[PDB]
Every structure is written in structure tokens, then in C-alpha cells.
Design a protein around this ligand. Structure first.
Ligand SMILES: Nc1ncnc2c1ncn2[C@@H]1O[C@H](CO)[C@@H](O)[C@H]1O
Ligand SMILES: Nc1ncnc2c1ncn2[C@@H]1O[C@H](CO)[C@@H](O)[C@H]1O
Ligand SMILES: CCc1ccccc1CO
Ligand SMILES: CCc1ccccc1CO
Ligand SMILES: [K+]
Ligand SMILES: [K+]
Lengths: 332, 332
């Protein structure tokens, strides 16, 4: 057909973020692992919320943010993720659809309720997330819109999807459909503790070719091979997947393809407000560039631009025009 | 007794804000009165939401913001306002309590649902609100915690309360209880169209002595006497209430008591980001000052500081420390 309905389909845990500031002692007092995604049950969610200061709500979900970012840039995006039939679910549905992302996953009931993450931003701008999965545990093969996967240049998913019980089945279904239709699969390693949990599974997805493009930050790449040697991590990840995009925070990023390396610089920041969404938006920029036929370096540049923008605001999805910024940057 | 549980009790429509940016044509296309509080029904709320871009949620409510502001400054605050037993009501309840405000108004059920206001912020930083009152229509005399009123130095309420059916009955009960215990009553005129709707009623509250301190902006003062002569509005408002605090946006504010007038300058600002909450937070600073025995001029200065802070951020409640800012500004 070579007119394809979607550039990027993303699949992830559909989450509403609940965002507040705290001091670092707050994290110690509450045994929250700093800079990480901390899974919590319903009881702990109530407890942490009762200790949290006044907050702001914003639609989140790592892959949700990535899909929103692609649409913002001007690409055609779709999302699979499960919310509940509740007000948080309505908020999530509105936000992603209002950005121009195709989102048609039907809620299954009011319980478990829509996933939320209590995100605590410390003075350094680091974020520490405390996520109750709620309705995310219900995502499964029944939620795969086969025609959408078939009609999407790239299907991208979260490592985080290995926590709920049935999501991985949906992903395997996606990989089959995408590849039978000549499309590509991509994943993010998500979080270094997530990598600790599913290391063998993730390596298997890469080595079997179910995943073609892998996103990682330094911490995740190191965790993947249980090494403190970043150069080893880079060499191995390159051997394990067709393309790897490895972010290094303020040190930019490196794109790896076989023996090719392409290094990109980070944009010089005024002040880091909140790092929430940085990796998500790097992926939006990269995949937007990738599905527009841009060079790997230019994909990296677009990722860095989008990540740099998101970290200068509160909230995980840029409130400003990424396409406008990309035009100004000569990235177009 | 000479110990009082509360400095300021506030009473208002309990609302969660849904905040987005729009261009000025959006307001025209949707027939939204710029800079005003536009009341909407359920059907309209759904329509407007469907046309709204991605949004952020934050606890609002004019008097809610004012109570939160007083508590942020270090005063002792309480709030009466009615939410539903739903997720938006839970968010509202959390945010105001987490600020250290006494909030004990019991939801009556899930329906009508918790009030929300779609607030569109234009490029000039002006905010245009579209409010579905939902559970606010249920606030009545049954919600008056008589001991809280009796133990508060000042009970402050919104003119906006004249829209729901029975809220005014609660306010009359508050006025009786406050004055029988030697406390003071205060109101804000809220909005110039709200003044158009309830002009006679508001003047009656002031002239009968049920209200002692009145807050108004320029537009509201002009509306109250249906005049284009600001000097006349000031002279008349000073005649109608014991104390009047009249704000003039970038021109600061004037405090009137009998024949006394006290002019206070606006603080220097970086940028008008979002004007939402300006008037609310002016009242926070004024009423905190007032209940700490500060002079009327210093009350005005504390108001202008709190207002100028809130307009430089997204959302109606300052995310930073007002007491620290007050100390730093030498108001202490
Ligand atoms: N378990 C999880 N799965 C997917 N996304 C998550 C999880 N926990 C937090 N998030 C999202 O991570 C985003 C930041 O990358 C936040 O917007 C937050 O919603
Ligand atoms: N009808 C209403 N009554 C009380 N407060 C309102 C109303 N409509 C909007 N608001 C609030 O006014 C605040 C700005 O002053 C916002 O936080 C918003 O929640
Ligand atoms: C909706 C706010 C919230 C967050 C975590 C746990 C419980 C609640 C209340 O519904
Ligand atoms: C809570 C989001 C919202 C806002 C206005 C009108 C309807 C809805 C749907 O829940
Ligand atoms: K951010
Ligand atoms: K504001």
C-alpha cells in the first residue's frame, strides 16, 4: 500500500500522574527508591497519597507520552493501553485523543480503577515514581487492534509491560503482525530495576528479532549486562539488536547500528525543572525522525531536542509545539 | 477564649480545574466570554471538553484557593465546600487537606459529580473559565459546622455562591453564628457578571451588616454600581461596607475604611503566565495579614505579593512557599 495509516503505534501502561515536590528526606522516610519506578499496591497508594503534599494531575504512561510526542511533532500516532471507566480514565482518554493520537482501547469496568503514579520531584529535578497499576493489569491480546499494528511503520512498547500479567501476550501478538506486514518493532528498557526483573526476557526479545530497535539509558544498558563498563554495554547492545539508541542524560546520546556509532549532543538547559518524560520524548523524537526517513544522527538530534524541551517544564508531555521547535532547529 | 482554632474560614464552590492554553479565536468560535466565569450544563461541559486540547488538572475553587493561600502563609484555615464521592472529589479533598486546611464537608453520593471548570488561558495570560457546578448545587445549611464558624476570626465567602440554589442559606447561617461570637464576615464579588446577576442581594448583604469586609476588582466595583466612574465606585463601596479591598491588576490595590484610603503597588513580575487565582490569593494575603493584626496597608502589601506570585505560574494555588516569599520581601 505504501500509504500507511500510522507512523508509530505505542503500547504501554495507561497512567495518570499525580505530581508533587518533596525534600530528599521525604524519599528516605518513605523508603522510595530515588529516580526509579516503584510498584505499589492499593493500600500503599492510599498511604503515600495521604503523606503527599498538594499535587497536580497530568496524563502519563511512558508509551502514552511517546505517542503524544510523535503526534505533537506532526507524525501519525496510535496507542494501546487500558484504563477504567472512571474519571481518571476519562482524563487519560481525553488527553491522548486531544493530541491527535488514535486511542480506542475499551475500559472493561470500574475496578480495578485507572492506574496512577505518584511522582515526587526533588530539588535537583529528579523524579521518583510510585505506581499503582490498577486497570493496566487487564491489558491483553484482546486489546490488540490487528489492523492498526499492520498499518503502523513502527510498533513501540515498554519494558514496563512485563510487570502486569497478560500484556506480554499482546506484545508477542503485535510482533507477529508487525513483522508479517514488513513493519518494525521497538522497545524501551524503561527502568533499570525493570531490567533487573526481566533481563533474560528482554535479551531474548532482542536476540530472537522480535524487537528491532531498542531504547536504553546508561543505567539500563549497564543493568542489561550487569556491568559497570559502559563501553562493554554499548558493544554488547549493538550485537544484540539491529539499532540501539542509548541516552546519556546531559552527555547526549549514541545511536548504534552494527558497527556504526552516531553521537548526538544534549541541548544546553536553562534549569532542569522535572526530568519526568525525558526518555519518553527522546523516543518520540527518534521515532518521528525514523518514520520520516531521516538519518540515524538526525533521529538522535530530534530525540535530544524533544527530551530537552520536556525537562524544562512540569509534567511528562510537552505543553508547547515540538514541530515549531524542530523547524527552528533546522530539523524540520 | 483568646485562642481561636482558625484565622480564616472560607466557603465556596468546590471545583477541580481543567487547564489548557488556547488561541484567541478559540474563545470566539466557542462563544466563551473572555476573562469571565461562564456557567455551563453537563451537555456543554462534554462538548467543550471534546474541543479542548490536552489539559492539566489542579484543585481550584475561588474560596478553596484563598483558604489554601492563608495556610501556605502560615495562618490557620478551614473550608466548607461540597464535592461528590468520586475521583475528582478525592483529589480536591486531598489537595486542600494536604495544605493543612480543615476540610470536613461530607460528599452526599456520586451524583451529581464533583464540579469542574475548564479554564482556557490565552497568550496574554488571561483566563476564561467554564464551570459545571455538579455537586456544588448540594451545599446547604446542613454543611455549616457551627463550631468552626464560631471559632474562626473571619468567615469569607464567594459571590459565586449565589448561583447554586441553597448555598446562600448556609451563608446566612454563617453570618449569624460569626457575629453572635464577635467574628467578622467577608465576601468577594467574584466576577462582574456574577455581580450583574446578584447586585441587589450583594448590596443588601453589605448594607444590612451581614458582610464586614468586601473584596472587589475594578470591573466588579464598576458593575456593583453600574457606573463607568471608578472614583464613584470607590466612594460608594466605602459607604456600603466597613472595609473594602479593591484590586486594580497591574495598578496594585486600594484599601478603604470610612474616609481612609491606602494605596498599595503591584509587585514586579517576570511574566503574566496565567492570571488564574490572582484575586483569590490577594484575599489570602490580605486576610492572613488582617488576622495577624497587621495594618491595612501591610494587609494590601501581603495581598499584592501573594497575587503577583500566583500569576507567574500555571494553576490557581502557589506551588512555592508564600511565607518564605513574605519573609524575603520583608513583610514577615
Ligand atoms: N509502571 C509503569 N509503566 C509505564 N509507565 C509508567 C510506570 N510508572 C510510571 N510511568 C510513567 O513514566 C512516565 C515518565 O517516563 C510518567 O509520565 C509515568 O506516568
Ligand atoms: N462558579 C465558580 N465558583 C467558585 N469558583 C470558581 C467558579 N468557576 C471557577 N472558579 C474558580 O475560580 C478560580 C480562579 O479564581 C479557579 O481556580 C476556578 O476553580
Ligand atoms: C485520586 C487520588 C488517589 C491517589 C492514590 C490513591 C488513592 C487516591 C484516591 O482515590
Ligand atoms: C473529568 C473530565 C471531564 C471534564 C468536563 C466534562 C466531562 C468530563 C468527563 O469525565
Ligand atoms: K517534565
Ligand atoms: K496562575
Amino acid at each position: 500500500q505504501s500509504m500507511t495509516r500510522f507512523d508509530v503505534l505505542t503500547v504501554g501502561n495507561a497512567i495518570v500522574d499525580i505530581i508533587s515536590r518533596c525534600n530528599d528526606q521525604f524519599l528516605i522516610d518513605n523508603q522510595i527508591t530515588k529516580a526509579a519506578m516503584n510498584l505499589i499496591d492499593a493500600e500503599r497508594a492510599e498511604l503515600l497519597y495521604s503523606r503527599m503534599g498538594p499535587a497536580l494531575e497530568a496524563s502519563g504512561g511512558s508509551a502514552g507520552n511517546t505517542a503524544a510526542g510523535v503526534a505533537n511533532l506532526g507524525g501519525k500516532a496510535a496507542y494501546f493501553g487500558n484504563v477504567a471507566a472512571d474519571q481518571l480514565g476519562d482524563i487519560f482518554t481525553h488527553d491522548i485523543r486531544a493530541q491527535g493520537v488514535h486511542y480506542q482501547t475499551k475500559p472493561k469496568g470500574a475496578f480495578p480503577p485507572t492506574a496512577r503514579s505518584m511522582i515526587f520531584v526533588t530539588e535537583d529535578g529528579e523524579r521518583s515514581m510510585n505506581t499503582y497499576l490498577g486497570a493496566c493489569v487487564e491489558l491483553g491480546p484482546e486489546d490488540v487492534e490487528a489492523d492498526v499494528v499492520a498499518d503502523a511503520k513502527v510498533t513501540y512498547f515498554e519494558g514496563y509491560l512485563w510487570d502486569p500479567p497478560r500484556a506480554k501476550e499482546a506484545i508477542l501478538d503485535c510482533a507477529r503482525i508487525a513483522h508479517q506486514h514488513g513493519r518494525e518493532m521497538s522497545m524501551t528498557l524503561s527502568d533499570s530495576f525493570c531490567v533487573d526483573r526481566y533481563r533474560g526476557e528482554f535479551l531474548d526479545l532482542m536476540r530472537s528479532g522480535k524487537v528491532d530497535i531498542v531504547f536504553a539509558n546508561r543505567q539500563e544498558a549497564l543493568s542489561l549486562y550487569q556491568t559497570d563498563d559502559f563501553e562493554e554495554a554499548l558493544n554488547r547492545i549493538a550485537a544484540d539488536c539491529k539499532i540501539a539508541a542509548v541516552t546519556m542524560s546531559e552527555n547526549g546520546a549514541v545511536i548504534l547500528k552494527g558497527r556504526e556509532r552516531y553521537y548526538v549532543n544534549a541541548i544546553r538547559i536553562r534549569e532542569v525543572v522535572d526530568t519526568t518524560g525525558a526518555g519518553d520524548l527522546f523516543a518520540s523524537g527518534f521515532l518521528y525522525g525514523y518514520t520520516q526517513g531521516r538519518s540515524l544522527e538526525d533521529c538522535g538530534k530530534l530525540g535530544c531536542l524533544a527530551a530537552g524541551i520536556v525537562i524544562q517544564q512540569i509534567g511528562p508531555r510537552p505543553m508547547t509545539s515540538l514541530s515549531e521547535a524542530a523547524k527552528q532547529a533546522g530539523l524540520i
